[PDB]
Structure 1
Amino acid sequence: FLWHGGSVWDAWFSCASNQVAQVLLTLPYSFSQLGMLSGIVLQIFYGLLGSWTAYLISVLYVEYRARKEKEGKSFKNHVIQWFEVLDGLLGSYWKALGLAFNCTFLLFGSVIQLIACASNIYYINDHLDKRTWTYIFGACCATTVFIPSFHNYRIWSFLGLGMTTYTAWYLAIASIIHGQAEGVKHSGPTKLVLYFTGATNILYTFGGHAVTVEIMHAMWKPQKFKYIYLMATLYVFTLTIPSAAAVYWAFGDALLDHSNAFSLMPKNAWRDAAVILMLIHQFITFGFACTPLYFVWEKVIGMHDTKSICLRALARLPVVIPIWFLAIIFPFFGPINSAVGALLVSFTVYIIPSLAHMLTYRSASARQNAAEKPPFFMPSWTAMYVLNAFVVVWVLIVGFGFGGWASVTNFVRQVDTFGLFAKCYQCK
């Protein structure tokens, strides 16, 4: 009860901002690297852990606002940010950590959208290789230095949800109708590097929810908290499990060579519709990631105020040129999710939110005068502390130690094979 979350519409507007658009096409690859038994258990595991960490971020936001409003403060005409909460609760070293990590991740999450945009357009008009489509789409994305901000974020998310729901159910039904071939093989785990570069792509997937609660996070007065609101957290499962299971079931071990699943499906108007919807979706996730970087760069350089559109744009172009060169040089759609999710997501989404919560409520004085008692599904404090320590140690060893070695070895293998400035990655 009294969950500071809102009504049914705001509650579903939080599951809408659970971006799983682009990574949806690289999950059969991970299944072919792991097998059927490990692919499902790990998806459920990481989905539950992601929901837990999102809850942690929420309770920390509420704790900070509640502490600040008591000593005398007005939060009117001023939205709170993540690094501000970290600075207010822990100190300045945490304000530096939660800024460096959240800026590096936002830099590397747009290279991926540019790569995917240049990759999916190849399965409509394959007269120009993927590097020329990267030239063209980078020149198109370098025009976001003219769009100031977004006037509305509700409609974009509510349309992205449907654009994802069409593709996640085309990929399953087309694969079922196509059936199995004659002499396809489902070999499970063979090498270690492959198992652990698949597990990290699965870790990456379920950290997109908590990453938005670290940037926008709108909150308001509490409501009565109908308990049906929880049934919107487990709606990404009907998007990710059937589509990834039914493509691997049909196409076997031909997927450890094709990271984009559109390359195996038979061409039809439905496939063309899904490519276009995915392009429209991945063109929105690029601006929603490049806007905070623009804001932070303008604040840092000391030029927040600008009246002409020609001055803002011109000053705002050391931030989109490395996002372009990095997409041109390393165009590895699918092997890059593992590296990014092993080096940045494991710290941004999992270890830091659970370490801040452990370090905040250390003393009994901080635990008796708390803004929110422990939830109904976790009564004691020892339960929360044990769960946090487990999350920290697990993501530290399996997510960073093994995942890191495996994913970086795979990323270097791709460069050894295809070279730098590759012309067409995984084209016949």
Structure 2
Amino acid sequence: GSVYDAWFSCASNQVAQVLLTLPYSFSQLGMMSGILFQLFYGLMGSWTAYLISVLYVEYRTRKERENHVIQWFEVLDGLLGKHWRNLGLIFNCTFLLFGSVIQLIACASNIYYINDKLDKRTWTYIFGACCATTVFIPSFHNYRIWSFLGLAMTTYTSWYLTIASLLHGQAEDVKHSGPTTMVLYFTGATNILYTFGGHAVTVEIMHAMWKPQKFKAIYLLATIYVLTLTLPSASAVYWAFGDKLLTHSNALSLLPKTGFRDTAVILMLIHQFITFGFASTPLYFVWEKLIGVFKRAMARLPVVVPIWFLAIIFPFFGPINSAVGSLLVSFTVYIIPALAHMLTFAPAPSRENAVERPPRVVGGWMGTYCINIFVVVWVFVVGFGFGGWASMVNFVRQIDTFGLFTKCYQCP
């Protein structure tokens, strides 16, 4: 894969469905805090990808001096022993199970907005089967070169949301109460945390390059483009509708029904189904290996049954993003990538003999360790501590409001 091919991957593996939920998040944070968090986590999310990049280079160089595919649960094994391999494997697979569920919930939610004759829960049955057929495909890693399409699908939707909101225009009923409560505020901040970071598949992309060393720069440019997709779409939609978004998690529910809006759903539905096969093809690999194992394709289904159940019992499109973000992404994409870097380079011989030197601008090892400590401290307290509690108390509130196995979420 070429260097530019990866940039299409880091930009398509980024916001897929959360792009629709970001406007809902700002209604809980306010426009000011909303912009700052995306920039704040955008840089931290881009910084942790660098941490995953130096770790991968260190692993391969050590292993080459003493191969077809590498993954995160194996890089930790080589550097920090098998104890971290189990730690990384569980958190990644748990994030893929729920991360894959979010796609199924999003697909069912989006389709409802072009054909409302069937309720959203029923659409989870139809799309659940259309997402359970992923077991009948050997793998999607071989088709990671078509990521340029995913960027186009996300690019059009982001530019529609901002342009459509601006043309729609706000009205007298529109109000912007900003951070009304801490439960809502931290729930929104967790959606932005869930948005950025790398999504745990940042180590597989690097192995496809002719020169994996320069990935750290590519991701930063890939995150800068994402901010161009999220900052104007989320800021504009919030401006047009304001607090009305609080009861409308999906931005497409508020924008007027139009042929252009239909395109947003159709293009976005494809991008989420493919993103569903990208967040489940690793699950079908670990799962089959664990059980030892068309004789194989059908056997993958057991993994899908949890995806159906979670997607149907908790169709909470908006709040689920925060529930996954605070408990799993905060420990899978921010804290573990940061702890591993600190542990591996803790010994003096490893640090001095590091394959790649630390950045001069950051300030050498002293700067890198200080930043890594901040990442762990900030995400652990705000990302997991406050974010987890606020997300959970907001998540359970959905159960009271809409009930278990709700027929339809946040629809008229």
Q: TM-score range by the shorter chain?
A: over 0.9
Residue 406 (structure 2) aligns with = 422
Structure 1 alignment gaps of length 5 or more? 1-5, 304-308
> How far is the alpha carbon of 1:151 from its aligned partner?
6.8
Task: Confirm whether residue 397 of structure 1 aligns to residue 386 of structure 2.
Answer: no
| Counterpart AA for 1:385 | Y
Structure 2 alignment gaps of length 5 or more? none
Residue 301 (structure 1) aligns with = 291
Residue 194 (structure 1) aligns with = 184
Match of 1:50 among 29, 45, 53: 45
Residue 136 (structure 1) aligns with = 126
CA contact (8 A) 1:17 1:212 kept: no
CA change 1:48–1:154 in 2 (3 A) is same
Q: CA separation in 2, counterparts of 1:216 and 1:224?
A: 12
CA contact (8 A) 2:88 2:332 kept: yes
CA contact (8 A) 2:11 2:223 kept: no
Q: The residue matched to 1:185 in structure 2 has which SS?
A: coil
Deviation larger for 157-166 or 361-370 = 361-370
Residue 217 (structure 1) aligns with = 206
Post-superposition Cα deviations, 1:61-111, rounded to whole Å, max 9, x if no partner, equal: 1111111222x3xx3xx3122111111111121011001101101111111
CA contact (8 A) 2:27 2:243 kept: yes
CA change 1:151–1:421 in 2 (3 A) is closer
Q: CA separation in 2, counterparts of 1:13 and 1:338?
A: 26
Count, aligned residues: 411
Task: Confirm whether residue 60 of structure 1 aligns to residue 55 of structure 2.
Answer: yes
Residue 174 (structure 2) aligns with = 184
Q: CA separation in 1, counterparts of 2:299 and 2:372?
A: 43
Q: The residue matched to 1:319 in structure 2 has which SS?
A: helix
Q: The residue matched to 2:317 in structure 1 has which SS?
A: coil
Deviation larger for 339-348 or 216-225 = 216-225
| Counterpart AA for 1:23 | V
Q: The residue matched to 2:103 in structure 1 has which SS?
A: helix
Match of 2:241 among 242, 246, 251: 251
Q: CA separation in 2, counterparts of 1:101 and 1:227?
A: 23
Residue 85 (structure 2) aligns with = 95
Post-superposition Cα deviations, 1:92-146, rounded to whole Å, max 9, x if no partner, equal: 2101100110110111111111111111111111111111111111122121121
Q: CA separation in 2, counterparts of 1:366 and 1:93?
A: 19
> How far is the alpha carbon of 1:364 from its aligned partner?
1.7
> How far is the alpha carbon of 1:375 from its aligned partner?
2.2
> How far is the alpha carbon of 1:315 from its aligned partner?
2.0
Residue 391 (structure 2) aligns with = 407
CA change 1:115–1:375 in 2 (3 A) is same
Task: Confirm whether residue 328 of structure 1 aligns to residue 312 of structure 2.
Answer: yes
> How far is the alpha carbon of 1:224 from its aligned partner?
9.9
> How far is the alpha carbon of 1:370 from its aligned partner?
1.1
Q: The residue matched to 2:157 in structure 1 has which SS?
A: helix
Q: Equivalent residues in 2 for 1:15-414 (5 A)?
A: 15-70=10-65, 72=66, 75=67, 78-150=68-140, 152-207=142-197, 209-220=198-209, 222=211, 230-303=220-293, 309=294, 311-414=295-398
CA contact (8 A) 1:122 1:129 kept: yes
CA contact (8 A) 1:106 1:293 kept: yes
Higher helix share: 2
Percent of pairs identical after alignment? 77
CA change 1:10–1:135 in 2 (3 A) is closer
Q: CA separation in 1, counterparts of 2:223 and 2:176?
A: 31
Deviation larger for 375-384 or 225-234 = 225-234
Q: The residue matched to 1:26 in structure 2 has which SS?
A: helix
